[PDB]
């Protein structure tokens, strides 16, 4: 019926209901490292997640989102290529059916096992809904996940997946510290883009970290046990919930490092 990642309702069909899919600043894109422009005027990123308040985790039929209380400047992102304070509202992942695919952004055509998106909205706009009507309304921090050693800080997320196996299910998920998902370095690439899922709105200053975090095979395997379907419907494993790379067109990807 509506949108998804299957053969009959996947990314290639999105343009029919969301014409912006063929827009000028669509995401994700391939990051050509030799064409990215080192911009020495970019400030370092400033991630202030010490007061973060996670509230819930839910399976929305497309991915699982961990939501945060964004009623106050509790967990924010500023600095980098951003002007203003962006508030963390939630994070989710995109992953594949196999270790060699899953990320949305690619680096020199290399695909990672998954990609974490920490979604933030520009506070000057009042609420998330208004931010999605502005060219600089959102800032998504993207982090690549490669399969290797286990990420301790990701385990609490992994263990709770059993209780939100199907579409629509949710579970209280308090006291989760998102700082446990950050890599060691905050070096990044940035470019103007969009939401990678419908409505595909062209807001979003993408901030993709250079350094991937590593998770274990067992950790990513639990992601693959989730379902796209609701309880009582035919089981469809939630895998490959990623959108292929879009044409860069008239945009330049800047890097904070050389």
Ligand X SMILES: NS(=O)(=O)c1ccc(C(=O)NCc2c(F)c(F)c(F)c(F)c2F)cc1
Total residues contacting ligand X by CB under 6 A comes to 10
Total residues contacting Zn ion by CB under 5 A comes to 1
Site for ligand X in 79-118 (CB under 6 A): 117
Work out whether strand 45-48 and strand 138-147 pair parallel, antiparallel, or are unpaired.
unpaired
Q: Is 62 a catalytic residue?
A: yes
Site for Zn ion in 92-121 (CB under 5 A): 117
Residue 197 in contact with ligand X, rule: CB under 6 A: yes
Is-contact 133 110, C-beta < 8 A?
Answer: no
Choosing from 2, 62, 105, 120, which is the catalytic residue? 62
Residue 199 in contact with ligand X, rule: CB under 6 A: yes
List the x/- string, 198-217, binding to Hg ion by CB under 5 A.
Answer: ---x-x--------------
Q: What is the smallest separation between the CB atom of 196 and ligand X, expressed in angstroms?
A: 4
Non-local CB neighbours of 67 within 8 Å, separated by 6+ positions: 54, 55, 56, 57, 58, 89, 90
Q: Which does 119 bind (CB under 5 to 8 A by kind): ligand X, Zn ion, Hg ion, none?
A: ligand X
Q: Which does 203 bind (CB under 5 to 8 A by kind): ligand X, Zn ion, Hg ion, none?
A: Hg ion
Q: Which two tokens stand for residue 142?
A: 């993207």
Q: Which does 215 bind (CB under 5 to 8 A by kind): Zn ion, ligand X, Hg ion, none?
A: none
Q: What is the smallest separation between the CB atom of 28 and Hg ion, expressed in angstroms?
A: 17
- For Zn ion, which is the closer residue by CB, 105 or 117? 117
Which residue stretch of 31-39, 95-103, 197-205, 218-226 sits at the interface with ligand X (rule: CB under 6 A)? Answer: 197-205
Q: Which residues make up the interface to Hg ion (CB under 5 A)?
A: 201, 203
**Residues assigned a catalytic role:** 62
Q: Which residues make up the interface to ligand X (CB under 6 A)?
A: 117, 119, 129, 132, 140, 195-197, 199, 201
């Amino acid at each position: 019926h509506h949108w998804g990642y299957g053969k009959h309702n996947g990314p290639e069909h999105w343009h029919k209901d969301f014409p912006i899919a063929k827009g000028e600043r669509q995401s994700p894109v391939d990051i050509d490292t030799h064409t990215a422009k080192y911009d020495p005027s970019l400030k370092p990123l400033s991630v202030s997640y010490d007061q973060a308040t996670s509230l819930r985790i839910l399976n929305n039929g497309h991915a699982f989102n961990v939501e945060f209380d964004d009623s106050q400047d509790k967990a924010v992102l500023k600095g980098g290529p951003l002007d203003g304070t962006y508030r963390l509202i939630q994070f989710h992942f995109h992953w594949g059916s196999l270790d060699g695919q899953g990320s949305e952004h690619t680096v020199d055509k290399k695909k990672y096992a998954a990609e974490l998106h920490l979604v933030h909205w520009n506070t000057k706009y009042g609420d998330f809904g208004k931010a999605v009507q502005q060219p600089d309304g959102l800032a998504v921090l993207g982090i690549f996940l490669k399969v290797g050693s286990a990420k301790p800080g990701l385990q609490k997320v992994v263990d709770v997946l059993d209780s939100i196996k199907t579409k629509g299910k949710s579970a209280d998920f308090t006291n989760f510290d998102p700082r446990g998902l950050l890599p060691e370095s905050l070096d990044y690439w940035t470019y103007p883009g969009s939401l990678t899922t419908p409505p595909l709105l062209e807001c979003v200053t993408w901030i993709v970290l250079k350094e991937p975090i590593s998770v274990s095979s067992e950790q990513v395997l639990k992601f693959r046990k989730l379902n796209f379907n609701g309880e009582g419907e035919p089981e469809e494993l939630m895998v490959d919930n990623w959108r292929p790379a879009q044409p860069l067109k008239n945009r330049q990807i800047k890097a904070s490092f050389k």
